[PDB]
Design a protein around this ligand. Structure first.
Ligand SMILES: [K+]
Ligand SMILES: [K+]
Ligand SMILES: [K+]
Ligand SMILES: [K+]
Ligand SMILES: [K+]
Ligand SMILES: [Mg+2]
Ligand SMILES: [Mg+2]
Ligand SMILES: [Mg+2]
Ligand SMILES: [Mg+2]
Ligand SMILES: [Mg+2]
Ligand SMILES: [Mg+2]
Lengths: 178, 173, 153, 214, 56
RNA sequence: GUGGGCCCCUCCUGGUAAGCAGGACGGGCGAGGCGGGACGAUCCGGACGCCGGGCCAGGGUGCGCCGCCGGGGCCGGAACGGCGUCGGCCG
């Protein structure tokens, strides 16, 4: 026998490959995984992991959030491994270069009409595979409504709302309401 | 298997008592690791110096010449199931360590006392006239003769490979 | 147990020490306390207001609040597989300034002091767990000869 | 390429270092067991003793298995890297290590190794930990690549550092995987060596105990 | 019939299996329970420091 | 899924006691093969993929039944009795 329990923890499971059946996702992930193994750049390593994520870990990005984040560094390439949607509450857009997995039809029309460019990750792969003058960006992973009900509403330090409809008063008017 | 050792020891020196006293003992043990342990068993009782608080300066091993047969007198104390006792024993052997082998086997056999139950107080040579035990004294004489005390032992031993024979052998005496 | 009130099982720990009854000396109120300081909790059994529960006697914590009359102390407390950070409010008679980091401030001051002095080579400033002794000579001119003694009963 | 030139030159530089250090260390080992002799002798002309230095390294062997161990015993044994019943390690001596080892005495036996015992263990049972892998130690090319920052370049530098308990003992000692020795010969596994048993402190008698297990 | 009342025999081993957790790093600095008269003056001081103020 | 547990070592409480009943740190059986304790869920060793070689823990070595010789002694259970035998201490 051998004692391999004390001071040793249980191993970990993480996504090491995309589970999408889309052939365009497999082709791109397999390609950027190759560039990492021949470059050792940590930009191509973070980007290879973003392409394995599960679509609740890949929230969207709006143009107005990009226009805000890319301010004062407007000569750089925003890189987003998700969809770029449109924000109609912003009346005027600036000129910028964005590379994304997918563009909405209305967001593409606005980006181009300002003088910007809409790149794809295979355009990025050919011209800038190691991320020179590129910035990686993502949206708010905790914006989902589902992640707002996690926990124990009813416990005195919760700050979470219950799930159904509750029409009573008992425990719902603060402490000393039970 | 017993061996004679001389051990030196002393309390660790401090500010109140620079240059503490040195204590030496003669020990009989099967090796150097048992002997140093037995030195700390006595220095803890007689002088109240635990092993944590002192250091051992030497474990001298002494080899004795044999070649002649002398008497030894051992003053010891041992423990039984009802208390503690004193006892004097005499033996004839060729070196002091061999005389302590003989003592430990007689204690183990007639008193059922083991090595760590026994404390040796004294071990000295005893001149022929001064002996006090009958068994030893018989052989401290001129011209002692006896016939062989067990000649059957020779014949049986040969009969362990010579398992079958044609006559029952004799025992010459 | 069968009975578990707030001051149960307190017959000895809340009692006063021999010939140490009466009012606390006035250093209890002239000490200055600061945010972030370490303190010990020791219950004085003659002062009944702001007196912490018996669990907290003999623990060490850190000040998080300085109030007009009482101090706020944070205690790490183990509960059944996790540690909890507990916050309590205790009056001055049950708090004493703690020296748990006294040894560490003396060493940090001593290393920067002995660096300033340079002894041209910098001395080794790491603490050393006691090493085995080195080789040396000792005299045996005067040596005592002991032996086991006889049983006396 | 330039890789084959540097690897050609480097090994050559390491090899001539191996013939320099071998002869000097052989000189050192003869000289110790001499200087003590002249110092014990100067002791005799006076009424004086010579008390030498205590051990600085121990060799520790595990002699009991894994069924039924208590929690504080099994944590101490894992920090010593003694996870299997016949494994052996080298170990530094100070009050931190000595007081932990006395807690697990009935599981272990230990003492002071010679430079001959150290040499046979490394040359015959020596493997290396490299990126978490157990790699056979067969030549000076692997001791240089891993330990050159601490000025250990050949097998006889590793032996010298372990025997003298020098400046880089921690890194020299952890480079070795724990020794995987053959099964031991015991009198009485459940008794201390000073009662005729097998466990605990046994001094210089550790050298013939492991001799048959290497 | 009667069944067992109480034991804690296996409970220290269950308590240790996932390690003994530690409280969040941010619980050590929670404002909950501090003097309000101190927390008021803390906000006021920063709002009027141009290096710290976050007013538009 | 579980919320009938039980046993060992040390430490305890009720009871004349119990293979009785109730608590405590650590370990085990439960849910742990293999060897040994003649025989046993828990004792002594040792914790397990399928093989070949070597070394040997615990217990042992007249024949059943794998494996031994040499050397020194002696020859279930209470109060209480013994000029059985060998060895001591005090007078
Ligand atoms: K709910
Ligand atoms: K509690
Ligand atoms: K009764
Ligand atoms: K088990
Ligand atoms: K009798
Ligand atoms: Mg192994
Ligand atoms: Mg836990
Ligand atoms: Mg029962
Ligand atoms: Mg069951
Ligand atoms: Mg059987
Ligand atoms: Mg047979």
């Amino acid at each position: 026998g051998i004692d391999l329990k004390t001071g040793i923890k249980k191993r970990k499971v993480e996504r090491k490959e995309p589970k999408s059946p889309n052939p365009y996702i497999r082709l791109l992930h397999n390609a950027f995984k190759v560039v990492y193994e021949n470059t050792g750049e940590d930009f191509t390593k973070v980007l290879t992991k973003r392409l394995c994520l599960s679509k609740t870990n890949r929230p969207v990005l709006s143009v107005s959030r990009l226009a805000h984040l890319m301010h004062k560094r407007e000569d750089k390439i925003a890189v987003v491994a998700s969809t770029v949607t449109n924000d109609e509450r912003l009346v005027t857009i600036p000129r910028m270069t964005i590379c994304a997995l997918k563009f909405s039809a209305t967001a593409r029309s606005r980006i181009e009409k300002a003088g910007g460019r809409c790149m794809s990750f295979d355009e990025l792969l050919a011209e800038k595979p190691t991320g020179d003058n590129c910035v990686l960006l993502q949206g708010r992973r905790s914006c989902r409504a589902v992640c707002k009900k996690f926990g124990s509403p009813g416990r005195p330090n919760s700050h979470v709302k219950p799930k159904g409809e509750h029409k009573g008063r008992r425990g719902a008017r603060g402490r000393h309401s039970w | 298997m017993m061996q004679k050792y001389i051990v030196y020891g002393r309390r660790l020196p401090s500010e109140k008592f620079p240059e503490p006293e040195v204590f030496r003992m003669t020990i009989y043990a099967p090796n150097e690791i048992v002997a140093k342990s037995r030195f700390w068993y006595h220095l803890k009782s007689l002088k109240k110096i635990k092993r944590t608080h002192g250091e051992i300066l030497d474990c001298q091993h002494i080899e004795e010449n044999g070649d002649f047969v002398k008497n030894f007198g051992v003053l010891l104390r041992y423990r039984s199931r009802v208390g503690q006792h004193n006892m004097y024993r005499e033996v004839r052997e060729t070196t002091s360590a061999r005389a302590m082998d003989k003592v430990y086997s007689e204690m183990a056999g007639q008193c059922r006392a083991r090595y760590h139950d026994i404390q040796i107080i004294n071990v000295k040579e005893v001149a022929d006239e001064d002996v006090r035990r009958e068994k030893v004294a018989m052989f401290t004489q001129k011209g002692v003769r006896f016939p062989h005390p067990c000649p059957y032992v020779h014949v049986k031993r040969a009969a362990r490979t010579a398992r079958f024979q044609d006559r029952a052998p004799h025992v010459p005496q | 147990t069968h009975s578990q009130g707030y001051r149960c099982k307190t017959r000895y720990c809340f009692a006063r020490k021999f010939r140490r009854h009466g009012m606390a000396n006035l250093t209890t109120y002239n000490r200055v306390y600061k945010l972030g300081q370490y303190v010990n909790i020791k219950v004085n059994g003659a002062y009944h207001k702001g007196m912490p529960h018996r669990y907290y006697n003999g623990r060490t914590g850190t000040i998080f609040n300085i109030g007009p009359r009482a101090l706020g102390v944070q205690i790490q407390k183990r509960v059944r597989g996790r540690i909890m950070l507990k916050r309590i409010n205790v009056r001055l008679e049950h708090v004493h300034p703690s020296d748990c980091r006294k040894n560490h401030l003396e060493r940090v001051a001593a290393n920067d002091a002995a660096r300033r002095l340079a002894g041209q080579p910098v001395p080794c400033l790491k603490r050393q767990n006691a090493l085995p002794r080195a080789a040396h000579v000792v005299s045996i001119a005067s040596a005592i000869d002991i032996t086991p003694l006889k049983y006396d009963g | 390429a330039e890789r084959a030139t540097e690897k050609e030159k480097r090994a050559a530089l390491v090899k001539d270092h191996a013939v320099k250090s071998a002869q000097v260390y052989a000189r050192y080992y003869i000289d110790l067991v001499e200087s003590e002799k002249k110092a014990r002798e100067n002791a005799l002309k006076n009424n004086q003793l010579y008390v030498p230095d205590e051990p600085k390294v121990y060799l520790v062997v595990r002699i009991r298995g894994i069924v039924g161990v208590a929690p504080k015993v099994r944590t101490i044994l894992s920090l010593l890297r003694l996870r299997q019943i016949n494994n052996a390690v080298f170990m530094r001596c100070n009050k931190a290590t000595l007081n932990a080892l006395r807690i697990v005495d009935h599981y272990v036996t230990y003492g002071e190794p010679t430079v001959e015992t150290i040499r046979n263990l490394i040359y015959k049972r020596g493997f290396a930990k490299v990126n978490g892998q157990r790699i056979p130690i067969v030549d000076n090319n692997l001791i240089d690549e891993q330990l050159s920052k601490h000025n250990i370049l050949c097998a006889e530098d590793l032996v010298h550092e372990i025997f003298t308990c020098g400046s880089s003992f921690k890194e020299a000692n952890n480079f070795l995987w724990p020794f995987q020795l053959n099964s031991a010969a015991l009198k009485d596994k459940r008794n201390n060596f000073a009662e005729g048993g097998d466990f605990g402190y046994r001094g210089k008698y550790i050298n013939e105990f492991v001799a048959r297990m290497i | 019939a009667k069944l067992k009342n109480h034991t804690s025999k296996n409970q220290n081993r269950k308590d240790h299996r996932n390690g003994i957790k530690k409280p969040k790093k941010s619980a050590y600095t929670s404002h909950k329970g501090m003097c309000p008269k101190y927390l008021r003056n803390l906000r006021r001081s920063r709002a009027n420091d141009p290096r710290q103020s976050l007013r538009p």
